[PDB]
Nucleic acid binder design. Structure first.
Ligand SMILES: *P(=O)(O)OC[C@H]1O[C@H](n2cnc3c(=O)[nH]c(N)nc32)[C@@H](OC)[C@@H]1OP(=O)(O)OC[C@H]1O[C@@H](n2ccc(=O)[nH]c2=O)[C@H](O)[C@@H]1O
Ligand SMILES: Nc1nc2c(ncn2[C@@H]2O[C@@H](COP(=O)(O)OP(=O)(O)CP(=O)(O)O)[C@@H](O)[C@@H]2O)c(=O)[nH]1
Ligand SMILES: Nc1nc2c(ncn2[C@@H]2O[C@H](COP(=O)(O)OP(=O)(O)CP(=O)(O)O)[C@@H](O)[C@@H]2O)c(=O)[nH]1
Ligand SMILES: Nc1nc2c(ncn2[C@@H]2O[C@H](COP(=O)(O)O)[C@@H](O)[C@H]2O)c(=O)[nH]1
Ligand SMILES: Nc1nc2c(ncn2[C@@H]2O[C@H](COP(=O)(O)O)[C@@H](O)[C@H]2O)c(=O)[nH]1
Ligand SMILES: Nc1nc2c(ncn2[C@@H]2O[C@H](COP(=O)(O)O)[C@@H](O)[C@H]2O)c(=O)[nH]1
Ligand SMILES: Nc1nc2c(ncn2[C@@H]2O[C@H](COP(=O)(O)O)[C@@H](O)[C@H]2O)c(=O)[nH]1
Ligand SMILES: Nc1nc2c(ncn2[C@@H]2O[C@H](COP(=O)(O)O)[C@@H](O)[C@H]2O)c(=O)[nH]1
Ligand SMILES: Nc1nc2c(ncn2[C@@H]2O[C@H](COP(=O)(O)O)[C@@H](O)[C@H]2O)c(=O)[nH]1
Ligand SMILES: Nc1nc2c(ncn2[C@@H]2O[C@H](COP(=O)(O)O)[C@@H](O)[C@H]2O)c(=O)[nH]1
Ligand SMILES: Nc1nc2c(ncn2[C@@H]2O[C@H](COP(=O)(O)O)[C@@H](O)[C@H]2O)c(=O)[nH]1
Ligand SMILES: Nc1ncnc2c1ncn2[C@@H]1O[C@H](COP(=O)(O)O)[C@@H](O)[C@H]1O
Ligand SMILES: Nc1ncnc2c1ncn2[C@@H]1O[C@H](COP(=O)(O)O)[C@@H](O)[C@H]1O
Ligand SMILES: Nc1ncnc2c1ncn2[C@@H]1O[C@H](COP(=O)(O)O)[C@@H](O)[C@H]1O
Ligand SMILES: Nc1ncnc2c1ncn2[C@@H]1O[C@H](COP(=O)(O)O)[C@@H](O)[C@H]1O
Ligand SMILES: Nc1ncnc2c1ncn2[C@@H]1O[C@H](COP(=O)(O)O)[C@@H](O)[C@H]1O
Ligand SMILES: Nc1ncnc2c1ncn2[C@@H]1O[C@H](COP(=O)(O)O)[C@@H](O)[C@H]1O
Ligand SMILES: Nc1ncnc2c1ncn2[C@@H]1O[C@H](COP(=O)(O)O)[C@@H](O)[C@H]1O
Ligand SMILES: Nc1ncnc2c1ncn2[C@@H]1O[C@H](COP(=O)(O)O)[C@@H](O)[C@H]1O
Ligand SMILES: Nc1ncnc2c1ncn2[C@@H]1O[C@H](COP(=O)(O)O)[C@@H](O)[C@H]1O
Ligand SMILES: Nc1ncnc2c1ncn2[C@@H]1O[C@H](COP(=O)(O)O)[C@@H](O)[C@H]1O
Ligand SMILES: Nc1ccn([C@@H]2O[C@H](COP(=O)(O)O)[C@@H](O)[C@H]2O)c(=O)n1
Ligand SMILES: Nc1ccn([C@@H]2O[C@H](COP(=O)(O)O)[C@@H](O)[C@H]2O)c(=O)n1
Ligand SMILES: O=c1ccn([C@@H]2O[C@H](COP(=O)(O)O)[C@@H](O)[C@H]2O)c(=O)[nH]1
Ligand SMILES: O=c1ccn([C@@H]2O[C@H](COP(=O)(O)O)[C@@H](O)[C@H]2O)c(=O)[nH]1
Ligand SMILES: O=c1ccn([C@@H]2O[C@H](COP(=O)(O)O)[C@@H](O)[C@H]2O)c(=O)[nH]1
Ligand SMILES: [Mg+2]
Ligand SMILES: [Mg+2]
Ligand SMILES: [Mg+2]
Ligand SMILES: [Mg+2]
Ligand SMILES: [Mg+2]
Length: 311
RNA sequence: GCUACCUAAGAACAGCUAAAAGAGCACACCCGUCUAUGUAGCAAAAUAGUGGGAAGAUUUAUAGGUAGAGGCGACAAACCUA
RNA sequence: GCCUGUUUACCAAAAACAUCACCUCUAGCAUCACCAGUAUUAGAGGCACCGCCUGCCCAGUGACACAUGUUUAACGGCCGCGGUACCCUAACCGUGCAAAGGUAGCAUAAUCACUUGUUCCUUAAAUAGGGACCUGUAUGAAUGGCACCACGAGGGUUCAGCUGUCUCUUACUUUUAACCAGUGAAAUUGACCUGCCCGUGAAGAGGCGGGCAUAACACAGCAAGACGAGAAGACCCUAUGGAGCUUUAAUUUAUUAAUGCACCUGCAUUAAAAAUUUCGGUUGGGGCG
RNA sequence: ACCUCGAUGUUGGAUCAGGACAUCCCGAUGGUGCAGCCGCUAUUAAAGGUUCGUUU
């Protein structure tokens, strides 16, 4: 740990493919079949960047927030997470975990009276509550369909689940979720943003895996773990990957893990005499494997919002 | 007499790494992933390269068996003389 | 998707089918499959190796009720210190002192008498109970979901190299080519002495109208037109034209399987297997009359 | 529902582009709330030109 991040004109990365451009006009074509809107985010990013569009555009149905990924999260400061959301205007938040289905039972109260607290306009006679989940990629929207299908319908899996952003393609059909009070979920492709706030807020959202690692950079994401595992005093990468004691240079930490994993690469280096090939430790493969252990949870439960928690 | 499966009694499977592996590399063999040529063609489905398997749920010679309201089928509602 | 395998000979090799393992169903048995077998077997299937946990459709009173824990109980070694002994070897006395203790009530698995159920009489409404008696009151289950260790001519993504893929093509060689010689097809083809522009027209003209152009013929290229050639468009519709398949469509039960007034045979009932025949007209995309 | 169901093949792309001008640039002018620079608009002009990538 030396100081903060020298971004030095890093510039925001931007990924807006045909998923979110086409999805938005198929999401906005279907607000007559929606009784509630579910916001699903990472618990690593509750406050800093949620979404530019989704907050103020969608106001007709009331909001409920589902901050998923609570197993890789420390909630000693749960009291003030509510504080920044209460001051925003966001009232109810349900933190969920989706391997033991922890606190996933508790939402099934908290949707039923919420539609009852408000008006329904057209669907005054319908007993079937068709509700919609929307959000940025890779946060827990498709697993929320399958966890809620598991513990209430006791039926099974209805949506493809496996960790890489963008392998669900478009707006699919309805999915039965429960028999006790009836409720249908609509699955959406993850609309992230046309523009992503600032540069620092861009990397906080890019770190959880919601964007491909190519447009941002594997070693660019690699140094930002060293910002958040050394300045937070959460030195939790030194019992799995303990190199000598602890380091803050991205050059040194990608060195020693490549020895421990046995990584080799053959790179055309460009010296002044000509093009020669030198065998090097595989710095992208070291930047890959250092990022996967972060997402598995074998590096420590971290908050990414300590920079905005200061004050 | 093709083909699908079966019966009878037969045959084939180098070298290499490993040891009793429906193991790995790889011939002979079997199959046909991709490309190109070919499209009245060499061929009513082939050639050249690249590929999958190649001691096994393998491949194959010979003789027999099941026949159409049927046979046979590791279901492609495939195959039963184009 | 577990894997090796398997499949549409001739447009699909796959994520499909198969696969151990697991689960459900049927069968207590001989001489022609199963099988010269016998429930750890055989058949019919489902799912896909192994791995992980979710509680249960015995209705009552009251008592049985476990360590673990709680209901709650005494005394002394090494050594330290103050003294009395005294060349010394070092002693003696008076003390301080850790752990060590597990009677025994009690939420609390062990298993059962009791309006409690059967049956039968009064009302001839159930007056609302009298009885007669007693039901070893059969082990209290057993099904869904998750899950990457390898593997893959599977579907995506990526690091690095690499190379005419590309920027931007070039050179050469062979085949082809063109020409000379020999042999010699095929689709195609109303007749054509077969131009361009604008207009026209069955709505896109070589042929019609008004202009324009125009000696005649070979050879090599080109692919804009001849709605170019090949195959009575696979999409849409029609036919009281077919066929495959499925049923809770109609008509049937001869046929097999059961019983009826040992098998056979003759008439009935309930099923299984099927057989035969059709699927009006008017809006078809409807946001589902 | 007019031509074609005795076959008029389906978007973009590659290649080659022919044309219109209702002009995006270059050229020539009128007006400006046109100081200069940038512009805005109109007239005139089709000779020439109109890039390379990321994303299924
Ligand atoms: P990649 O090379 O990006 O894929 C190319 C795509 O071509 C498609 N396509 C061919 N012909 C089409 C057509 O007549 N009409 C459409 N709408 N698309 C056509 C196309 O879609 C089928 C391809 O990409 P994908 O299949 O991956 O889907 C993206 C596709 O979605 C459409 N879209 C995106 C965003 C938005 O705001 N509106 C849209 O309509 C685009 O067509 C886009 O290509
Ligand atoms: N180590 C670990 N992994 C988890 C945990 N929970 C979820 N995962 C992982 O994340 C899951 C993937 O989530 P998924 O909904 O498929 O994300 P996605 O990549 O955006 C897929 P799609 O594009 O279809 O929406 C699984 O791959 C895997 O179980 C956890 O508690 N621990
Ligand atoms: N560690 C952990 N991760 C979880 C848990 N639950 C959900 N996740 C994660 O949530 C992520 C999935 O988000 P996802 O539902 O796929 O977002 P999406 O919008 O559908 C992606 P797309 O853009 O394609 O639409 C995954 O990285 C992973 O499953 C959990 O209990 N633990
Ligand atoms: N429209 C449509 N949806 C399907 C089809 N198959 C699956 N789905 C959707 O995917 C969901 C999950 O199906 P799985 O077979 O469990 C279904 O509930 C339905 O929403 C299909 O053939 N058509
Ligand atoms: N797996 C699967 N997905 C389908 C199928 N048909 C449609 N889909 C899903 O629905 C999408 C198209 O939805 P709509 O036709 O807009 C597809 O891109 C795919 O995600 C199908 O047959 N199989
Ligand atoms: N019917 C049908 N066949 C297809 C389609 N796409 C591919 N195929 C078949 O698969 C073959 C191989 O295609 P792969 O995508 O390489 C094709 O030659 C064709 O036979 C499709 O959309 N429809
Ligand atoms: N016209 C046309 N040509 C096509 C189509 N699909 C492929 N092509 C190819 O493009 C070429 C260009 O022909 P023109 O479009 O007539 C054709 O010769 C053919 O090879 C299509 O749908 N229409
Ligand atoms: N119009 C058109 N779209 C095409 C064509 N080939 C592919 N596509 C588009 O690409 C998509 C992907 O199909 P692939 O050919 O598997 C199609 O669904 C279609 O949208 C083509 O020849 N014409
Ligand atoms: N009127 C006209 N505008 C043109 C012409 N050529 C180019 N343009 C203009 O230039 C633009 C170029 O577009 P880019 O390729 O994005 C066109 O959209 C059009 O506005 C032309 O011949 N006439
Ligand atoms: N017309 C005009 N503009 C000037 C002159 N000097 C400076 N400027 C303006 O000042 C600008 C640069 O000066 P400053 O350093 O910003 C120029 O681009 C121009 O706009 C001058 O003499 N005449
Ligand atoms: N080559 C190229 N890059 C572009 C284009 N548009 C955007 N980009 C890239 O995306 C970046 C972000 O552009 P946004 O318009 O802010 C650009 O700085 C450039 O790198 C384009 O038309 N061509
Ligand atoms: N339209 C389709 N899209 C995707 N898979 C298909 C498909 N039609 C067939 N298949 C695949 O082929 C398998 C076998 O189908 P077949 O028509 O019996 C299916 O189980 C499925 O895996
Ligand atoms: N001096 C030179 N150097 C390189 N290439 C040359 C050359 N002289 C001729 N060429 C080649 O010859 C081509 C032109 O000759 P020819 O017409 O093909 C060029 O495009 C180039 O590829
Ligand atoms: N230096 C060069 N490199 C490559 N090709 C060449 C060349 N000089 C000549 N040529 C080839 O020879 C042809 C005739 O050229 P010459 O000088 O007339 C060229 O068109 C090209 O194909
Ligand atoms: N312009 C032309 N016209 C006619 N025949 C030609 C021709 N050019 C070549 N040929 C033919 O090709 C033959 C070989 O020609 P190349 O130039 O060698 C000639 O003798 C002649 O038969
Ligand atoms: N007018 C025409 N006459 C003859 N053959 C033609 C033709 N137009 C096209 N073709 C044939 O079809 C091929 C592809 O052309 P596309 O469909 O335009 C051509 O290379 C040619 O073989
Ligand atoms: N909705 C439907 N209407 C008519 N026939 C149907 C049908 N669904 C299925 N079938 C018939 O039953 C067969 C088996 O279908 P099942 O869904 O497995 C089909 O091949 C078809 O012949
Ligand atoms: N409309 C229909 N007409 C006839 N048979 C049908 C049918 N719909 C379904 N079936 C039959 O029922 C089976 C299962 O369909 P069910 O709706 O789950 C099909 O495979 C087919 O045999
Ligand atoms: N090479 C070129 N040839 C022709 N017009 C061009 C061009 N480059 C640009 N342009 C035109 O000029 C306009 C202004 O470009 P400038 O660099 O601001 C562009 O929007 C385009 O219309
Ligand atoms: N080829 C071209 N033809 C016409 N105008 C051009 C041109 N290239 C450039 N220009 C003009 O010059 C301006 C700047 O040129 P570039 O930055 O060199 C463009 O905005 C455009 O107006
Ligand atoms: N470098 C360039 N050269 C030529 N045309 C360009 C260009 N950059 C942009 N254009 C074209 O100019 C038009 C608009 O750009 P302009 O500078 O506002 C578009 O048609 C665009 O494709
Ligand atoms: N020297 C010139 C300039 C313009 N003009 C006329 O000016 C107009 C077009 O301007 P040019 O493109 O500059 C036309 O009317 C043209 O006849 C001319 O006749 N002689
Ligand atoms: N340095 C200068 C000189 C003149 N100009 C312009 O030229 C006009 C005439 O200037 P002369 O010095 O007279 C000025 O009114 C101004 O519009 C300018 O912009 N900058
Ligand atoms: O019988 C057939 C039909 C198509 N084909 C060809 O197979 C190809 C099918 O398309 P795919 O996408 O490769 C296409 O080239 C067809 O002309 C055959 O070779 N045989
Ligand atoms: O060759 C093709 C393929 C698709 N398509 C169009 O694309 C649509 C989707 O086809 P894809 O291949 O999924 C199809 O319905 C057509 O409209 C074509 O027009 N031509
Ligand atoms: O010598 C020249 C002439 C013109 N050009 C380009 O052509 C454009 C048009 O010029 P003209 O002469 O109208 C000019 O603006 C330049 O972009 C050159 O690059 N060089
Ligand atoms: Mg099938
Ligand atoms: Mg009639
Ligand atoms: Mg009608
Ligand atoms: Mg037609
Ligand atoms: Mg014709």
């Amino acid at each position: 740990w030396r100081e903060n991040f020298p971004l030095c004109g890093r510039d925001v990365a931007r990924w807006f493919p045909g998923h979110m451009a086409k999805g938005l006009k198929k999401m906005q074509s279907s607000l007559k079949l929606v009784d509630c809107i579910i916001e699903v985010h990472d618990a690593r990013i509750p406050l800093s960047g949620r979404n530019p569009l989704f907050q103020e555009t969608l106001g007709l149905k009331p909001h409920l927030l589902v901050l998923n990924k609570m197993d890789l999260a420390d909630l000693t400061e749960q009291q003030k997470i509510m504080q920044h959301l209460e001051g925003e205007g966001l009232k109810n938040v349900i933190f969920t975990n989706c391997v033991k289905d922890e606190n996933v039972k508790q939402i099934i109260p908290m949707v039923t009276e919420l539609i009852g607290r408000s008006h329904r306009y057209h669907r005054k006679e319908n007993l079937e509550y068709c509700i919609m989940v929307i959000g940025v990629p890779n946060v827990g929207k498709s697993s929320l369909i399958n966890s809620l299908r598991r513990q209430h319908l006791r039926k099974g899996k209805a949506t493809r689940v496996g960790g890489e952003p963008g392998i669900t393609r478009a707006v699919m059909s309805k999915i039965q979720v429960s028999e006790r009070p009836l409720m249908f979920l609509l699955d959406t492709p993850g609309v992230l943003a046309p523009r992503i706030e600032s540069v620092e807020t861009g990397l906080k959202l890019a770190l959880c895996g919601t964007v491909l690692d190519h447009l941002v950079g594997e070693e660019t994401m690699a140094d930002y773990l060293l910002y958040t595992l050394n300045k937070h005093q959460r030195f939790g990468y030194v019992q799995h990957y303990g190199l000598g004691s602890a380091c803050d240079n991205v050059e040194r930490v990608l060195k020693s893990v490549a020895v421990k994993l046995g990584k080799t690469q053959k790179v055309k280096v460009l010296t002044g005499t000509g093009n020669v090939n030198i065998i090097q430790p595989n710095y992208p493969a070291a930047a890959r494997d250092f990022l996967q252990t972060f997402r598995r949870g074998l590096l420590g439960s971290v908050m990414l919002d300590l920079d905005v928690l200061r004050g």
